[PDB]
Each structure stands twice: as structure tokens, then as C-alpha cells.
């Protein structure tokens, strides 16, 4: 792919998301979604191989079905209200269809399989962009339409997402599938807190994006896509393994790291509204995520797996490409707990 074409497609994806986030018209929001998907498909199919083609095909099918459902919901809402402005939807059936379409776009359970499938199919940069941006946009739409969301359905989908992410991450071995299930669990947390405080939703989004960027960029730096491939990193650059370990600890919600702040704020907000059982179950279920994070950290940082012989040549040579904002994302993902009251600024 030509660099000019690649940057044009990236800017088209970003422009589609910006159009979705700045448009007050349902037709314009749908147009932004269509543009985002259209420009996103080649980014997935950059490195051409049958696995990438299959991942792109599955992603296209899922996103097209979600877009059709979203347009149907828009039309149904227009039928009973005659309004195009994105506000509290005036029809429960249209609201349910919109919620299901946005859940399918985000990856919430039971619409989650395509997330690990595509993430394994595509490369690390494609997975990073996919997760981050393609979860950034529908969450903005949901935050705009929050006041009409059915709490029962939203919380059911959120809890299912958390459980499914935990169990999938427990069983998986591939780094990209682990990241996909982590994304599913964090989206579950965000959508669980969504019907109560969109500010907490945005805070969780920002923290999750920072941690995911840090983890994916560390994986790109180490050029590891499996557990055993990552197990050789300690013999070439042990600093990266330690940074990855602290990032994994933060993603598990362990205090006093940055990952504990979203869970803490969400628990507080949900327990303000006389909801105890849901926060308790959500907090207890994150232990599965922390378990597979710790299992991944054992193989890379806290132990020394056997190495190979060409690693000496690896030592002789030096990394050339420099990651952008990697130290900043590492610091922001582990040491911003004492700056929690900035959520008022985020408000």
C-alpha cells in the first residue's frame, strides 16, 4: 500500500468518526459509520494473506448488519416522531434496535466472537486502531442517546461481556486474542456504568485506551505475537518485559495503579444509585482478567524461559524504529491515580 493512500485512509476513518461525534442528524451519523467502515476495511487488509482476508470479510459482514439494523431503528423512530435530531428516542422498539446495533458494533456479548476472530486475523497495528477507534465512535453515540437506554438490557449485555471476556482470556494463548477478550471485558464495564454517568464512561474509555495503546506498542516493539515469542524478550531487552509487567498489573485493576481508578469510580457511581449486587459481581469477575494477565506476566517478566542461539545476533543488532508517545502512555497507564479528581475536568 502506498504511504499516501494509507494516510488518506487513516484520515478518512478519523474523519468518519469525527463526523459521527459532531453530527446532530441521524442520517449524518449513519453516513459517518458507513465511511468509517469503508475506509477501515483496507487497513485490515493491508498485509495481504488469507487470514487477513477472512477477518476483513467477517468484520464487513458484522458491521454491515449492524448498520442495517441502525438505519432500521432510525426509520422506525422517524415514523413515530418525525424527528431526525439525535435525542431521547421516542419509540421503545427503535431504541432496542439501536441498542442492539451499537452493541454489535462495539463487540458486547453475545456479539463478541468477531472481536477475537478479526483481532487474531489482523496485525498488531490494525488491531490497535480497530479496538481504539471502532470502540470510540459507538460509545459516543450511546452517550448521546444514554437517557433512553433500557437499563435491564444494557446491564445484562455488560455483565455477559465481562463474564465472556474473563473466560475467553482464561482459555486463550494468543496475545491478540487475549487483547480482544480484555477489550470485551472493559467495554462491558463501560456499558455497565453508561446508564448512570457518561462522565465515568468517558473516564473508563480514556484509561482503557491509554493502557491498550501502551500494551500494543510494547508488543510491537518486542515483535511478539504469542506467549512463547514474548518469553524470549527478557534475553534481548529486559526493560520492555518489566514495563509490560507493570502495564499488565495496571490493566488488572491492582492498586495503586491507574487501572484501579475506573473500577473504583464505576463502583462508587453504581452504589450511589442503590445498586450493590451488580458492582459486587463486576468486581469479583475481574479476577479472571487479572488471572490471565498474571499468567502472561509469569512467562515474560517474573521467570526466565529458555532462549535460542541466534539471540546473540539479536543482541549484536539494535532496534531502529522509535515508537511515538510510548513512555508517555506507559506513565499515564500506571501513575495517574493521585490525579483522579480531574474527572471533573472531563465532565
Amino acid at each position: 500500500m502506498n504511504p499516501i493512500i494509507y494516510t488518506t485512509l487513516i484520515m478518512t476513518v478519523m474523519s468518519g468518526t469525527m463526523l459521527v461525534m459532531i453530527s446532530s442528524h441521524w442520517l449524518l451519523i449513519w453516513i459517518g459509520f458507513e465511511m468509517n467502515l469503508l475506509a477501515m476495511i483496507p487497513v485490515l487488509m493491508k498485509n495481504f494473506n488469507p487470514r487477513a482476508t477472512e477477518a476483513a470479510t467477517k468484520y464487513f459482514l458484522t458491521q454491515a448488519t449492524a448498520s442495517m439494523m441502525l438505519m432500521m431503528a432510525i426509520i422506525i423512530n422517524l415514523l413515530y416522531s418525525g424527528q431526525w435530531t439525535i435525542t431521547k428516542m421516542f419509540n421503545p422498539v427503535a431504541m432496542t434496535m439501536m441498542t442492539m446495533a451499537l452493541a454489535m458494533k462495539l463487540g458486547l456479548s453475545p456479539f463478541h466472537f468477531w472481536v477475537p476472530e478479526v483481532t487474531q486475523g489482523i496485525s498488531l497495528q490494525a488491531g490497535l486502531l480497530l479496538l481504539t477507534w471502532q470502540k470510540l465512535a459507538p460509545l459516543s453515540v450511546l452517550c448521546q442517546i444514554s437517557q433512553s437506554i433500557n437499563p435491564n438490557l444494557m446491564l445484562t449485555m455488560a455483565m455477559l461481556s465481562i463474564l465472556i471476556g474473563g473466560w475467553g482470556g482464561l482459555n486463550q494463548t494468543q496475545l491478540r486474542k487475549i487483547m480482544a477478550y480484555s477489550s470485551i471485558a472493559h467495554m462491558g464495564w463501560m456499558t455497565a456504568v453508561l446508564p448512570y454517568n457518561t462522565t465515568m464512561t468517558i473516564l473508563n474509555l480514556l484509561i482503557y485506551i491509554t493502557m491498550t495503546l501502551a500494551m500494543f506498542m510494547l508488543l510491537i516493539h518486542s515483535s511478539a505475537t504469542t506467549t512463547l515469542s514474548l518469553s524470549h524478550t527478557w534475553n534481548k531487552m529486559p526493560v520492555i518485559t518489566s514495563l509490560m509487567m507493570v502495564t499488565l498489573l495496571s490493566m488488572g485493576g491492582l492498586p495503586p495503579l491507574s487501572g484501579f481508578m475506573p473500577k473504583w469510580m464505576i463502583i462508587q457511581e453504581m452504589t450511589k444509585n442503590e445498586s450493590i449486587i451488580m458492582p459486587t459481581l463486576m468486581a469479583m469477575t475481574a479476577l479472571l482478567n487479572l488471572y490471565f494477565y498474571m499468567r502472561l506476566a509469569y512467562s515474560s517478566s517474573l521467570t526466565m524461559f529458555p532462549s535460542t542461539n541466534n539471540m546473540k545476533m539479536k543482541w549484536q543488532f539494535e532496534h531502529t524504529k522509535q515508537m511515538k508517545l510510548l513512555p508517555t502512555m506507559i506513565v499515564l497507564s500506571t501513575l495517574v491515580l493521585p490525579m483522579t479528581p480531574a474527572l471533573s475536568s472531563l465532565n
Binding site: 515483535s223 534475553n235 529458555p306 549484536q316
Partner: protein, 320 residues
Amino acid sequence: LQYGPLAFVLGERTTRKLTETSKVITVDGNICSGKGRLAREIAEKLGLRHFPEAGIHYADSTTGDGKPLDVQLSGNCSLEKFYDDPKSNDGNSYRLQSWLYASRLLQYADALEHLLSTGQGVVLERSIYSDFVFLEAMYRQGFIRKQCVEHYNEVKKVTACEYLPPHVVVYVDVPVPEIQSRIQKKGNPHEMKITAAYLQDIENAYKKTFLPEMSEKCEVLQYSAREAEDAEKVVEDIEYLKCDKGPWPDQDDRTFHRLRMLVQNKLEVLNYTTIPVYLPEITIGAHQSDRVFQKFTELPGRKYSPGYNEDVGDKWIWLK
């Protein structure tokens, strides 16, 4: 500046610098032949750049100071031990074979980078495409194992599926008795311990597999010893051949940009040479790996990046 997408956008195109002599003339040949002399003759006459045959201390040569490192820190293998005890129980034979394949892959990447950054052709004494003959010769004699052969095949596939094919098997066909006579005349005892069956297996691998395989891709120019003495005839034959062979005619500017980005990054070149396949011959224990890495870091000019080593005479560290 360093080559990249910004340079490509600005207009640094590879096909602009390419010429008729911009050819990766790999010269494939046999053991103890005049291939090294023939390659040097071809490089001078055609104006190309000659790469000496890749090795452990060739891999050691390109990085830092050109002086070689200790065998413990680099390679962990020796050719003399392979000659003395080919079937030793420490896996030195396959360890040496894998290290030599990695060195040849690095050398091919360097040659491609030089060709695509300067437009000058390159002459290689041996390449990764002809490296499998030694592995087959070892396997026939029983020096290495089937698992070693499978690991070599996997690494070779995943690492050589990327780069462009070589240019000529200049097979300096020297009979095995003449090879043995030359080895005896040279006088090195370790190579004098080479058996005749091992030398025959290399020739069988070249003639039965490598020669037919490369005939489809490109022209193959086979010469005897006396024919290879006349390098002018070889040069004339090289300049004569013209056809639509290989992917080079269909190579585009974008493909050349991708290839240059791949070959300018050595860690991406040597990425799949360390796949997690735990053969006893190549696997290193955790404690030994840690100790050897500590020694390598204790080496004089290799603790930090090249521009940030005070002990070797780097200044302005605090402003760099």
C-alpha cells in the same frame, strides 16, 4: 535523513536509481572451488561490490567495531569441532548450520539494502538459497536429525519467502577426487578430515535439487574449473542473457519501497530465526543465557546505543 514513508513521499524512488548493472549477482558454487576467486574477478570486471562469504564473525563484523567477538558471545559453534567430531552429542553441527544460515540471511539483507540504496550490483559467494545443500549433506551422513531438518525448513520458509531470488548458479563443477586433492594440497588438517561421502552429498544436492530449482527462476551458468579460469567468458555470458525471468521485471516502486523498509531493519530481518521451537541443539538454558547476556553487556562498546558509550569515547551525552 533515514529512508521511510516521508522520503518515499518526497520522491526517493528505487527504480530511478536502478540501472542495467543493478543486479544481485549471487554466484552459487561448490566447496573448495575457485568460486571465491571467480566472484572477486566478476565483481571487479562488472564494477559490482563483492561480499565475502558470510560467517560467525561476519555477523560480528557489521556491528560495533569490525573486530570479531568471542565464540562464546557470538555463534557458540565452531567449524573445527564439526570437522573433528561431526556426530558429537552437543548438537554443534546443527547449531553451526543454523548460525550460518542466519549469517547468510543477514548478508543477503545487507546486499539488498546496498543495491537498493546505491544502485550498484552485488556479488555473493553463497546465499541462503543454496545453503540447504550443507543441511542435506549433514542429514544424509546422519550428523543432524529429522527434527533439525524440519526446523531448518520452517525457518527457511518463513524467512526467505520475502526476498528476491538470486541471479546465477555459477556451478564450478569440480570432481570429488579433485576436491580432495585440492584439500590435501591446502594443508588444513580440519578440512583434511572431511570424508568423500560428505563432499559427494553436497554435489548431489546441488545438481539434483538446487540446479533444477533455480533453472526455472533464472538462467544457470555452469562452468568447469578450466572454464571458470577464464572469467572474461563468464562475464560475457552474464551480459548476454536477457529475458523476462524472475519477479524483477514486475517489481514496482511501492514493492521496492516495502523491500527497502524490510531490509533496512535488521531485527525485522532476523525475526523468525528465533522461533520458539525447543530443539536440544539450539535451546539455551535460562542461567547460561542470563550469564552470556551479562557478559555481552559487559563488552566495551555495547552497553548502550552506539552514540551513548562514554568508555569508547562518546561526548555530548547529556545533549544527545
